[PDB]
Amino acid sequence: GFTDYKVADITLAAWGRRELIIAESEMPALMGLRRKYAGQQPLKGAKILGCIHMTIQTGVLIETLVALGAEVRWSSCNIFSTQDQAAAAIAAAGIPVFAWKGETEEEYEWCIEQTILKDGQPWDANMVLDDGGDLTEILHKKYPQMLERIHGITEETTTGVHRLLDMLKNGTLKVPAINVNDSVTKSKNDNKYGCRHSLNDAIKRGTDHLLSGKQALVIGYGDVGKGSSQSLRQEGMIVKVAEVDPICAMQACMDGFEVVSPYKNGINDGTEASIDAALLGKIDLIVTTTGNVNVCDANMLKALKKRAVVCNIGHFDNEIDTAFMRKNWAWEEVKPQVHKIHRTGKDGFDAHNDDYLILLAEGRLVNLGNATGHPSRIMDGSFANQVLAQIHLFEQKYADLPAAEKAKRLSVEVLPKKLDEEVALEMVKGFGGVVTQLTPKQAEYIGVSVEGPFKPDTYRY
Amino acid sequence: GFTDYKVADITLAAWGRRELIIAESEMPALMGLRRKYAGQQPLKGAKILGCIHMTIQTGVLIETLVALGAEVRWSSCNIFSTQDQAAAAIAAAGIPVFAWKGETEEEYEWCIEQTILKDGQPWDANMVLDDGGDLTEILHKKYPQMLERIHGITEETTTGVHRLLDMLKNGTLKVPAINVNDSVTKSKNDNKYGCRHSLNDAIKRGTDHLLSGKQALVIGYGDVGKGSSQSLRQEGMIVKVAEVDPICAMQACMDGFEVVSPYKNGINDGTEASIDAALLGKIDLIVTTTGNVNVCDANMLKALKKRAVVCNIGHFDNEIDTAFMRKNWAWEEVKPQVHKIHRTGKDGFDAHNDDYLILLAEGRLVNLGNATGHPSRIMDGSFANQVLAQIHLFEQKYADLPAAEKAKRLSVEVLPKKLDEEVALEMVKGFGGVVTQLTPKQAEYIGVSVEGPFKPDTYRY
Amino acid sequence: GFTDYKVADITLAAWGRRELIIAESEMPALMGLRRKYAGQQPLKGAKILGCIHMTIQTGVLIETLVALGAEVRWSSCNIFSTQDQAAAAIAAAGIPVFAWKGETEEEYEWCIEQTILKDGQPWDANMVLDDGGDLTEILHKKYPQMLERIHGITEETTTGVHRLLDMLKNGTLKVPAINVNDSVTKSKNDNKYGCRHSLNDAIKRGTDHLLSGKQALVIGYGDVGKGSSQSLRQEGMIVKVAEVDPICAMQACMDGFEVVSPYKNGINDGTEASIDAALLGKIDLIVTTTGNVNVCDANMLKALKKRAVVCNIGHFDNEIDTAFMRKNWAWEEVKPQVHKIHRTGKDGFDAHNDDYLILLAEGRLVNLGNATGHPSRIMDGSFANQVLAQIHLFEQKYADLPAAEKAKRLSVEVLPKKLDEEVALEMVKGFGGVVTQLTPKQAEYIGVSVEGPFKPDTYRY
Amino acid sequence: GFTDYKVADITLAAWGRRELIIAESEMPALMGLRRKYAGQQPLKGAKILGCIHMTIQTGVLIETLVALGAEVRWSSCNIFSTQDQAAAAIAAAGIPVFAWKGETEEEYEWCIEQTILKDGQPWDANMVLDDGGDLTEILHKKYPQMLERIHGITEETTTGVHRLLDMLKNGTLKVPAINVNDSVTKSKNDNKYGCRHSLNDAIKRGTDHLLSGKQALVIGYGDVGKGSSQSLRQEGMIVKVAEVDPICAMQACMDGFEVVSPYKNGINDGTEASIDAALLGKIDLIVTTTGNVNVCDANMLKALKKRAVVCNIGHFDNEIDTAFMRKNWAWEEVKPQVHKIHRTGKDGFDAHNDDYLILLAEGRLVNLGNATGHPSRIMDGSFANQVLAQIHLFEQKYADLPAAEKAKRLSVEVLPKKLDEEVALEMVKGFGGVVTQLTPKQAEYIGVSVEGPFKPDTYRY
């Protein structure tokens, strides 16, 4: 009798359920929270709007929140990141989900509205779980009355956290948020090792190209850039790295990479003459990891080696100037989320043309677009933090506080290190690792409790 | 024309000068500071007490301070870390230096005193550069009147910073200090990549042991532990990692290491029954990296595989219970800083005994004891921060300020991120790396200045 | 009106053609032969029975053989290795092909018969291209008269060559063969680096398991074992290696792997008491690479850690005792070529049972069964050797020769080193690599020609 | 007492003996032969002329030969490769040895003659152990009557085997020889992994340069070139590889290296204009590994980046045109075996000249000249083959055979694979590895004995 959903094929639910059962055995921290908190039901009464990639891993996150007492309405934060068997299994469980792989931009917006509205009217939501900030901005711009009764936002990714901090700076953030990205068991696990696992994964599934012996250029060397560069280098690629941050560039040099710039002397003056055409003429694969705009621009695309692969693993697809390629070049679909971009003109192409580029996921997040994103055992850390962040903000009950009390708690904060450590401990135990217990003398020698926390907040790991 | 020094062999000065000239070509950030601030002469009047490993790298640091206007009196912070040709070259340049490789503990204390006192009476020092805090504590415990004329302390390493913070929280810190260690171009360069370069280097010079295919156990996975594990793994060792911090252990698992404890279930009950004898019976090499006490204890040493190598790369030698071995086991010197510890007895050993351990540098920090420590191009980052930290505190002139302003500036702080980035930039240029310059639109997009700083202070890299 | 084929779905032909166009640009050695030999038509009159994995890469091989003048009738040598879009593209080109992914065993035997028979009568073939030797043995055991007109066999893989050598020493081999496997551009490219690329690829596609931090056991350390071990180790797995060959075990040790046996002291007495249960109880992934029988036996499977992944990348599925699992344990299909094997027994599994193993491709070649096998740029080397071998034996015309001179040519040979090098050179050029030309003085100095061959036949590379 | 020796410092004997006792525990194959054969005395009556690097490892080899019953007279095959404490320890055991680190070329020849002659007349030698072929050449050209009574030669290295085969081809080889180099436990252990261990080791001891993030060019990708490339890559260097063998170049590409040539298009046109100056102007370190002549020629040396390090790890120094640098450029000794080559003129140099190269070991093999060569556990394999080869040829008694029998046995051969495997087995056991024993069914399946040999002679490993 349940119809409050829209997925690609509900008959895929049994397959999704089999994969959810597997993923549970791969996510000990998330399943540890399920057992620890099921009796006390900390999310009883919570009504969570969720917008994050509708994968098998998100499925385990959704059912954990529900198991702790929440009701949810869910959509994906990307048009290509949904796993249809995951969405089908969630909808089969009676959970409102509006997501499928290959949405159009209009369908993407429609799916978010379907979570916001129930039976044509605003849902009685009181919590928000977001990845990238799209759902968060729509609520602020269009549904401010709903935010009055929402207790908090838990944001997954670097880009979303940037947008939250902009709203806080401008005095336009309406409810407090927890920066889930900057838990060490998120940023230094998800962003880095997740992309290490899934970047070459997506490139292989999309192209089946040998990577060993070829030239790669990674734009950026943050957490995603670090993991992305290792994903290619461990496959045998000759990887060069571009960065605007000299500290990250220093790490790239020390990690054994040649730090280069697409522009002569690193100065992009807007002309084709500032492009290091000799450098780009050798690159077989360029990956953007910056969260910035136009870091693989039109003039870089013009100068790339013939038949090079172009992909983005940053959150939004404007890191590559795909708009330029649509306006000027002919797109030939090899298969879903794999396109040959013929640089010979806009209208038509010789099917045996050799002057083309291969674009993955149409410039969207390549790991989730052409593969399945991060593996369950890595997302275990990010999503255990998500559950702890939902519990924390829901227990605070910001929406119920008076005006003078709301003002003292309107912030974008991170979880305490003690909880960060406790998530990490379950992850380590999941590998069969054994952490040593400090003796009382040792604990006093380095000035910490035997239980932790073991590092000051300034520690960078 | 100069006789206020004490080195092992002044005839080594020409050799040391030849290596100093090479090291300058390997330290562009430090030498870059030398030229930029040369005419300004910002350290004129500075009289710096310096206590840090008297290596060739420290030699370039000393002559950078002198070139900027400073007068110094120097000693080493470790008995085995001095390079005798470096100390000879410094002494030959008319700089008071009291350091040589192979000091006794008595001679170690005498060397720090020869810097503190000039011609029988206390020097009119006004600045302090320290590595580990031994000189800092002597000043506070034995020469507190000299601290009245001292403007600040610049501390190199993790252990010294811990001691600085303890004095601050007890109200005993007499002068402000700069945590040079927690610059990213220090901790995430020196502590990590330095030990990656110099750990296997020191193990090779001491034993010439093949490392590939053997079993290692690294105690600790902080910055030193991360670099030490990679030093051994990149040589092909099978590395297991012990940690008390679950977050660091999580990093170790994701980095591809098995996380183990020397104690069953990680619980040391002080008894041999708690030792995982099967695990330690397979370890060919153990390395301590914790900055903690007794992390390789007497019971672990008894259970270690025969002929296993024992060494420490933390700052102080008490990470290993060498006192137990001195009390109970016979020591056979193979060569300087290499001993066979025969577990068959104290008062004699069969020349062909098979039941022994190999101890490097008598438990003192092994990279400087059995090799030359970190390479010049890495210490470039650390010591560019040291010079900047000295310039900062000396310009503050804390000692000449009223009491109301003294208590306001009495702190242990780090250099601004902007200087951290400018140090990193010179290091990248030294590799031939080219950093990209943000366009104005990109800088506005991510909310930074084109000049930087490029990261929020919370960023962990 | 061409209907002489059987594929899964001919409407996939255009997709396959798009991927064949890309594959051609990834296979410069194969496409170089196609253009070097097109006008000469060296395979005019050749009628080739081909039996090898019907992949995109095989498609480029087939169309190369056709472009040089040959007629072919093709099947796949494995029930799971066909790429249906590749089979469709070939069938759409008017080429008899009988292959689809997911054949039953009876359909597999039927497909080879459809190549052997045209219109119910034995085809007038004169060449054989084989991978594994199944087609070769059927011709010898069932169609011997057909071998009177066959000029030669070109065998792709290690297992197939073993079978050819057994027939040669028994005097049952009726036509000469070329050992394509033992070209250096095959065995030391395909067998090693191919599995390096495609082993972790298949495991990710089948399970999406995180590999970093988990425990793997690779049975065997030949060419396939070496590449498989590197596939897992580069992902951060802790890899242990098993071997019966001490020389190969020595290489594993030096490469940084712990060498272990599933049996106590390496002695398999057939009892569970000989299984090293403590070792296998920690293994998350076992991979067989031996070409031998029952190297992952029933008692090993009983002792494996719960939820461990089991797969074989050797040629035949009897490396793992899947017959035991099919007889005693309950199989739950997750998706095609992914089965959970519940060790709770044979009569009903619980969907939430935790005591299962995950078997990939039902024990068949996992890289081809769960992914797409080796990438085009690697198969370029193997299939360029295939073309040269087919040319060589077809030119010899063994079947049209005197009996005395036929006996002089009945042999299992490898291609000459000069052609091996010429294949490698085109692969090197495909990477943009530039080899150096020896000067005549240098060529004399080492006793070679400037043109090569550069190594004696004893050289092992 | 005993005076039949010449070494640097006899008082180093005790230190050398302590390191010999350690090395015995690192060489289980060599010590296993000592244990297995001591009672049989297989070398009773053997009188071995030995010319090979007088290291600690050669010391264990010498004492194993003596322990099996032989007498020896020894010299080093390189002027810089002797460890003076090893030579002193051997002389102190009453064994004739003529070697010291830092010989002149004239002293090198004198040392070899001191082994050949005892008390001014030819020694009653009957066996030869050689590394490089210098001793072999002198006997053929100057002492042919001694070769009448010599039963054979055991040659260690690739360059020496080449010289043997030249003499055999020309009919000038007077006694049979065993190619020790081409045992797999030699060439694929010593040549590869030995240089992996000792190349970066020697570069660090000589220069203490940071290697990570810098540019290397390895000339050659044979066994030594493969090991040398890994030695630099595992340290974080950006390694480019040069080769003339396209098969070896193919392996470099697949191993993740860019394959380049010092000459434009790989062609030397006899002028500086054919030098890729852009490439060489970026190289921080060049290593020659070829066994060829002038692979780092004068014009390459002129175009190398300022302050680049230049070293050779081939057997002979003529891989680098050191003669050109001697004639044209000023040499400044940094320290023993480390020279700055000032490219500003032959006359003199400014101490602060930036235009110099750093040459290690004056172009002689750098691992032995600037460090200690391969570690004991690797040399265990090579030198166990040496002992077995000495036994095999001494037992054959070629010198006592009639002319007609000599003709049937005058050859350059390798040890049988069975012995190669038994050497490997002891090396594997030294790591704690456990080799699996084949079942009788498994042995029959792959067609080998359960005892081995396990591979055909064609197998390349």
Ligand SMILES: NC(=O)c1ccc[n+]([C@@H]2O[C@H](COP(=O)([O-])OP(=O)(O)OC[C@H]3O[C@@H](n4cnc5c(N)ncnc54)[C@H](O)[C@@H]3O)[C@@H](O)[C@H]2O)c1
């Ligand atoms: N696909 C995934 O699974 C996944 C996971 C986590 C984060 N992300 C996304 O990836 C992006 C990066 O995330 P992060 O956590 O690594 O952030 P980060 O801030 O740590 O790294 C981004 C880096 O890009 C560099 N950069 C910026 N502009 C540049 C330019 N023009 N050229 C070169 N370098 C430039 C910055 O210096 C910075 O170090 C974000 O959009 C984030 O949401 C994706």
Ligand SMILES: NC(=O)c1ccc[n+]([C@@H]2O[C@H](COP(=O)([O-])OP(=O)(O)OC[C@H]3O[C@@H](n4cnc5c(N)ncnc54)[C@H](O)[C@@H]3O)[C@@H](O)[C@H]2O)c1
């Ligand atoms: N020799 C060198 O060149 C060099 C360079 C830098 C720092 N250091 C020294 O090395 C030490 C470590 O420095 P760091 O920067 O890595 O500090 P860190 O705090 O970043 O790392 C130390 C780690 O040890 C772990 N640890 C503590 N007690 C433990 C125990 N009983 N068992 C297992 N793990 C345990 C902690 O959890 C922590 O992660 C300090 O003494 C520092 O001064 C030496």
Ligand SMILES: NC(=O)c1ccc[n+]([C@@H]2O[C@H](COP(=O)([O-])OP(=O)(O)OC[C@H]3O[C@@H](n4cnc5c(N)ncnc54)[C@H](O)[C@@H]3O)[C@@H](O)[C@H]2O)c1
């Ligand atoms: N799937 C692919 O893409 C692919 C590619 C090439 C070859 N293959 C197949 O893989 C198999 C191996 O090929 P290869 O070239 O590596 O052959 P190989 O002879 O070089 O290696 C096989 C190794 O297995 C070892 N071995 C045998 N029995 C063992 C046992 N009981 N325990 C442990 N080790 C044992 C042998 O010592 C040998 O070193 C063959 O069947 C071959 O046809 C598959």
Ligand SMILES: NC(=O)c1ccc[n+]([C@@H]2O[C@H](COP(=O)([O-])OP(=O)(O)OC[C@H]3O[C@@H](n4cnc5c(N)ncnc54)[C@H](O)[C@@H]3O)[C@@H](O)[C@H]2O)c1
């Ligand atoms: N120092 C040591 O410890 C050590 C150990 C073993 C061997 N060696 C010596 O090292 C040398 C190489 O030994 P190997 O066993 O590796 O021999 P190898 O034949 O296996 O490798 C040498 C390689 O050099 C390549 N080459 C030749 N001329 C070249 C040129 N002009 N440019 C580029 N590449 C070129 C060849 O193609 C060949 O692959 C020999 O002289 C040997 O005696 C030294």
Ligand SMILES: Nc1ncnc2c1ncn2[C@@H]1O[C@H](CO)[C@@H](O)[C@H]1O
């Ligand atoms: N430590 C060492 N002791 C003795 N011989 C060595 C050592 N290192 C390398 N060699 C040998 O030197 C030869 C090259 O001259 C190689 O064949 C190798 O076996």
Ligand SMILES: [Cl-]
């Ligand atoms: Cl010439």
Ligand SMILES: [Co+2]
């Ligand atoms: Co998102």
Ligand SMILES: [Co+2]
């Ligand atoms: Co110190």
Ligand SMILES: [Co+2]
């Ligand atoms: Co086959």
Ligand SMILES: [Co+2]
């Ligand atoms: Co030699």
Ligand SMILES: [K+]
């Ligand atoms: K996934």
Ligand SMILES: [K+]
């Ligand atoms: K140093």
Ligand SMILES: [K+]
């Ligand atoms: K493929």
Ligand SMILES: [K+]
């Ligand atoms: K050595």
